[PDB]
Amino acid sequence: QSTIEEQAKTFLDKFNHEAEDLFYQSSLASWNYNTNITEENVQNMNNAGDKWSAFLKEQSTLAQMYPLQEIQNLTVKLQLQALQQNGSSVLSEDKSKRLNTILNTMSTIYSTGKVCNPDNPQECLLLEPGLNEIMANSLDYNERLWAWESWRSEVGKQLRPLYEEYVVLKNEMARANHYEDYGDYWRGDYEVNGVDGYDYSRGQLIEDVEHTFEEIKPLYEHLHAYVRAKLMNAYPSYISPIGCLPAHLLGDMWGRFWTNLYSLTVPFGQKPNIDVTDAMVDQAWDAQRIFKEAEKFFVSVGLPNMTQGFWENSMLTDPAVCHPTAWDLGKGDFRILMCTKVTMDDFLTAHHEMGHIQYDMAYAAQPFLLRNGANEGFHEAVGEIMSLSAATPKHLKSIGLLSPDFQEDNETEINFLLKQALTIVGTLPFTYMLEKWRWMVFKGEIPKDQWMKKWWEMKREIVGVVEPVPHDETYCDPASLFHVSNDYSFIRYYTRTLYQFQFQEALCQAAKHEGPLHKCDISNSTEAGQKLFNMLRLGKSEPWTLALENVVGAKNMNVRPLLNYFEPLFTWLKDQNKNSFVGWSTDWSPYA
Amino acid sequence: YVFRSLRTPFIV
Ligand SMILES: *[C@@H]1O[C@H](CO)[C@@H](O)[C@H](O)[C@H]1NC(C)=O
Ligand SMILES: *[C@@H]1O[C@H](CO)[C@@H](O)[C@H](O)[C@H]1NC(C)=O
Ligand SMILES: *[C@@H]1O[C@H](CO)[C@@H](O)[C@H](O)[C@H]1NC(C)=O
Ligand SMILES: [Cl-]
Ligand SMILES: [Zn+2]
């Protein structure tokens, strides 16, 4: 090709080799600290992690010598584009220093936030575990209200003036990088250009999120109405049969998930949940057995075994940081770090983390920067569908953790789907509405004097949730969630959720599965493993739209598979709700 | 933590 393209290819070839060596060495230090926490290693790992962050800055400068307009090879364009990003470099040194100070202060205000007893001002509670325990386990309306209000008053108010200047500085940075605003900048993770038939604009994400949410509304309104009727028995006299759910009664500090409402809403409380923890301890299962069974599951669909380095290097038990994590260091080195316990949860989590490893192994041959998920939602969606198959009674029988004669009754099935929906479906309105608020704020569509007014109009309208006390514009309730005060995009939790049921339905059709989608186990299906692997090996070398089509046969996000997964619960909920109101009036509030 | 990303390659 042309001289500029040839020189770009040569540059990228040298970048990819230099990056592999330094990333392997840098992430090798991360493995030392996270498996052997010492005072030396915190700064020793910083010495390796700072060396890595500066290398990308120098390589970014070198990448700018090759105009993107001259590159015709799309794989080279994709790599140059990721390298040519300026980010906060477009800001003046004063504005970068200010933004970084604001960012660090918001993060610190959140992580040190605490509320104290008004009668005993030295007795204080942190979010974890103190306030979180109240929000999950308290049945005292006023104690829940006190924790919900105090967090937003002590923490959120502190963040309000910081969040205003964060919006200004972030928008200026995004505009200088030729985006419309900071929200438009975040939506760039889904952008696809220059591939005919697979393009995707940044605005299209807003329309696709809003269209798929439209179809979610009937299921969510019926879940909401069922929960609301059950919550009236849990908190008598405090909940209107036609109104929104008071925001402090939802089982965590924000209502991000309804998971902790289960024992207050369980359809058939006498049917216990399927748990194979005891069956595993009885059969003398250890951590080695868990991951070996996980490896057998992936081998069963045509994916490879784990590597010799995996077993040699992975830390599968507490001897460290105990977050379940999958490691992709390069040079054929893959590891899992997990302080495994002999429980059903860790058996499911091990399938999740090895799904990450299978994804990592499949795209290991891609260029350095293309060794990533097709977009921000892909990787966790791949891990989630591994737990879906591994948790079914069907699969638990085949590995001998359920008796061969075990039949799951229809009341136990409804309990499981409802518990699933409280977490999976309950978070979708929350996630879309929060990100919609931020998107509109970044767009300049919500004036500062209406920030909290619009936040709670949108909570009432979209989420069916109402503030138990009025909040003026001294509050910054969004910033009282970690993701907002710590500058993380949120829509990934929406797209990942829809992706995972798109994946599972396609894999289960390929396996020619019979019956309800939620009972499917893709084990021993090489067709499903080949369908999945045709996307896994792409990394992000292809448009995410193409990678999705490789699994499910369509180019776009689709919520119909999620609706299919929950169809048995939807049918049951409509019958439960036949004498209840479905939906809500935004006019009721606990205080007015 | 270190990542194959240019936006957030490093977290301590
Ligand atoms: C782009 O370059 C790569 C090598 O870096 C090559 O394998 C690929 O075929 C090129 N693109 C096209 C469309 O041929
Ligand atoms: C990065 O900034 C430099 C200097 O302002 C500019 O020439 C270059 O085009 C920018 N790169 C991108 C990808 O915007
Ligand atoms: C997969 O096939 C093997 C060999 O027939 C069998 O032992 C195992 O139980 C099967 N697993 C499932 C989930 O069907
Ligand atoms: Cl809130
Ligand atoms: Zn994961």
Do A548 and A540 meet the contact criterion of CB atoms below 8 Å apart?
no
Amino acid at A35: T
Q: Chain A residues with CB-CB distance to B under 8 A?
A: 23, 26-27, 30, 42, 45-46, 48-50, 52-53, 56, 60, 82-83, 85, 87, 328, 368-369, 371-372
Phi and psi angles of residue A521, each rounded to the nearest 5 degrees, phi first: -135, 120
Is B1 an interface residue toward A (CB < 8 Å)?
yes
A102, A184, A426, A433 from A465: Cα distances, Å: 30, 27, 11, 11
Using a 10 angstrom Cβ sphere, with 0-12 exposed, 13-18 middle and 19 or more buried, the burial of residue A516 is: middle
Q: Where are the alpha helices (DSSP H) in A321-469?
A: 344-362, 378-391, 393-398, 410-424, 427-443, 451-458
Under DSSP, the state recorded for A335 is: E
Two structure tokens written together for A561: 């598979």
Chain breaks in chain A following residues, C–N > 2.5 Å? 319
The length of chain A in residues reads: 592
- Positive or negative: CA dihedral A276, A525, A354, A83: negative
* Distance (Å, whole) CA A149 – CA A172: 33
Listed resolution, Å: 2.3
Amino acid at B6: L
Structure determined by: X-ray
Q: Mapped to the 3 state alphabet, what secondary structure does A225-242 carry?
A: HHHHHHHHHHCCCCCCCC
Do A473 and A451 meet the contact criterion of CB atoms below 8 Å apart?
yes
Cα–chain-centroid distance for residue A264?
A: 26
Two structure tokens written together for A473: 């514009």
Do A551 and A504 meet the contact criterion of CB atoms below 8 Å apart?
no
Only one residue has tokens 């929406």, namely A494
Q: Which residues pair with A125 in a beta bridge?
A: A115
Q: Which ligand 3 atom is at minimum distance from the Cα of A395?
A: 13
Do A352 and A340 meet the contact criterion of CB atoms below 8 Å apart?
no
Q: Which ligand 2 atom is at minimum distance from the Cα of A85?
A: 13
Rounded to a whole number of angstroms, the distance between the first and last alpha carbons of chain A is: 71
Residue A505's closest CA among A561, A458, A580, A548?
A561
Which H or E element spans position A553?
A: none
SS3 B2: strand
The length of chain B in residues reads: 12
Using a 10 angstrom Cβ sphere, with 0-12 exposed, 13-18 middle and 19 or more buried, the burial of residue A112 is: exposed
* Residue bearing the CA closest to ligand 1, atom 12: A73
Q: How many CB atoms lie within 10 A of CB A216?
A: 20
A304, A350, B3 from A526: Cα distances, Å: 12, 21, 32
* Distance (Å, whole) CA A525 – CA A301: 5
Ligand nearest the Cα atom of residue A500: 5
Residue A560 assigned to a binding site: no
